[PDB]
């Protein structure tokens with residue numbers, strides 16, 4: 001059992017080709033072949049939570065729920081003949097049939113890494129090649145907008161890979177924001193990304209007048225903010241004298257936090273307005289192991305897998321791949 005022998009997808013074939021084209025051109029002798037596999041793809045729904053449901057769904061103004069496809073994908077490098085899993089990502093894709101405001105949008109739920117890619121000097125670059133390649137791929141299918149919440153894990157916590165190396169440091173926010181800006185400046189110079197904005201500038205330019213026009217994703221910041229804001233508003237009373245107030249709060253919260261939310265325009269102008277439907281050429285992949293991040297954090301803990309050194313992470317990659325061909 002090895003990474004290569006995991007079934008192929010167009011998405012995974014495209015990403016590993018862009019990465020290995022990049023490495024071959026670097027011609028660094030420390031580097032090894034990279035494999036990229038989608039290991040989970042399934043159809044999910046995000047439910048408008050009770051606050052927004054009472055205000056927008058009940059009045060016919062907004063959809064009760066938004067269908068998306070979730071996918072997990074992993075990248076692997078040959079080190080000393082052996083496969084090492086060094087990068088992981090979970091994405092939410094909302095297609096052409098999805099109602100507004102979610103239509104034709106991709107959202108990255110979680111990404112993660114184990115810092116052992118060889119060599120060090122190309123690590124950042126290869127991570128960028130994977131994310132830019134992902135944005136290239138969904139742009140070609142007809143997705144118009146990408147969405148990133150720039151949010152590092154808390155101290156000691158693990159988004160995808162169980163027990164990271166003690167010396168793999170969590171980036172602080174400003175560094176992580178600068179890292180996404182570098183990846184996006186490159187995607188702009190390659191004419192994949194048209195441009196990008198902080199959520200607050202995006203909303204101001206789209207002239208967002210209402211909370212129902214804001215894209216609504218599973219586990220994202222903004223739906224929780226809207227539930228807390230609607231609850232604050234409904235506590236208020238006023239004696240005699242002698243909605244828009246939700247928009248005013250959403251704007252204030254978008255200004256306080258603008259630096260952490262990226263809106264990435266993949267397709268701009270009239271080109272975006274007469275697109276054909278989105279057909280994902282890749283099939284569903286059921287795989288309870290990679291259905292969200294939790295099951296893989298649980299198996300790792302239970303089988304004492306760790307990604308805390310090259311040897312343990314090489315060991316855990318092998319055990320990961322066994323369990324993936326099994327179920």
Ligand SMILES: C[C@H](CN[C@@H](C(=O)Nc1ccc(-c2cnn(C)c2)cn1)c1ccccc1)c1ccc(C#N)cc1
Nearest residue numbers: 111112113127152156157164166168170171175176179
């Ligand atoms: C693509 C790659 C993912 N690296 C994850 C990362 O860096 N995890 C990490 C690193 C360390 C620990 C940890 C937990 N306990 N201990 C002792 C260490 C846990 N997780 C991560 C970082 C941030 C957001 C999401 C994911 C990357 C690497 C560098 C930057 C920058 N600047 C951005 C992305």
Ligand SMILES: [Cl-]
Nearest residue numbers: 109110111151
């Ligand atoms: Cl993330």
